[PDB]
Design a protein around this ligand. Structure first.
Ligand SMILES: CCCCCCCCCCCCCCCCC[C@@H](O)O[C@H](CO[C@H](O)CCCCCCCCCCCCCCC)COP(=O)(O)OCC[N+](C)(C)C
Lengths: 69, 175
């Protein structure tokens, strides 16, 4: 029965090791992403949560019929 | 027989007295046991001899599996999942082996109680003492961990006991 239907314990052991490594890395990445989201939304100094401002290319830099703009 | 180790499961030298007939009457037990021998023990012996002859023509082996020692839970970092996994498996194997040790000791105790008959209260003192020691050690190691036990909870229990013992020793030193 063992020879026909089942493998040795090492296969399940090392597959468990691989699964545990993947899951632990995913958990750490989730916590890191939450912290990064919090910091980026608080400071606004990252790529995320960038809200539009007025384009400076819309300004007319011409004499304006009055010396003081 | 040679199937089991006689030091792990010891027995006394088995002193039995010789028959001392005091009556001219015959012994029905001896006559009945001769009949039982000739009528039961011989055909069974022949069947076993045939079966063993068949077995000897096909001799193959199986082996006891060997496990090396991996680092314990004490040498594992807090979130290192792989080392914790290996240590937890080793701890569970050790727990099973300890249970079997207790089982062996209990078997010795029960066998001695049956063997000694009316003198068991005095003649089983050593087995009772061995069981007391093993039971105390096992209870210290594993009791009250509850369901969902692990190596970490066992380590926490041992640390708590060590702290209590160190405090008691230092307080007795100040006496
Ligand atoms: C001989 C008498 C004394 C001993 C009797 C023992 C009784 C055993 C027979 C009963 C069957 C046991 C249940 C089957 C469960 C096994 C399913 C699965 O786990 O096994 C697969 C194996 O597949 C097998 O083909 C299972 C087939 C069993 C299906 C049962 C069908 C019976 C139906 C009855 C039909 C009879 C006639 C019908 C007339 C209409 C594994 O696939 P694999 O990926 O390789 O695994 C790798 C492991 N290796 C490396 C060891 C190979």
């Amino acid at each position: 029965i063992a020879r026909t239907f089942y493998d040795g314990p090492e296969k399940n052991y090392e597959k468990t090791m691989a699964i545990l490594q993947i899951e632990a890395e995913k958990a750490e990445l989730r916590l890191k992403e939450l912290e990064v989201r919090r910091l980026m939304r608080a400071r606004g100094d990252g790529p995320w949560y960038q809200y539009p401002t007025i384009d400076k290319a819309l300004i007319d830099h011409s004499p304006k019929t009055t010396p003081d703009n | 027989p040679d199937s089991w180790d006689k030091d792990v499961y010891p027995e006394p030298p088995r002193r039995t007295p010789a028959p001392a007939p005091q009556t001219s009457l015959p012994n029905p037990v001896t006559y009945l046991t001769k009949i039982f021998d000739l009528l039961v023990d011989r055909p069974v012996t022949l069947a076993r001899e045939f079966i063993e002859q068949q077995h000897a023509k096909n001799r193959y082996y199986y082996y006891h599996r060997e496990f090396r020692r991996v680092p314990d839970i004490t040498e594992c970092e807090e979130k290192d999942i792989l080392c914790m996994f290996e240590a937890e498996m080793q701890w569970r194997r050790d727990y099973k082996v300890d249970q079997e040790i207790v089982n062996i000791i209990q078997e010795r105790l029960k066998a001695c109680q049956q063997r000694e008959g009316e003198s068991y209260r005095q003649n089983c003192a050593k087995e009772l003492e061995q069981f007391t020691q093993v039971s105390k050690a096992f209870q210290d190691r594993y009791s009250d961990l509850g369901a969902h036990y692990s190596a970490r909870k066992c380590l926490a229990k041992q640390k708590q006991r060590m702290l209590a013992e160190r405090k008691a020793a230092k307080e007795a030193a100040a006496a």
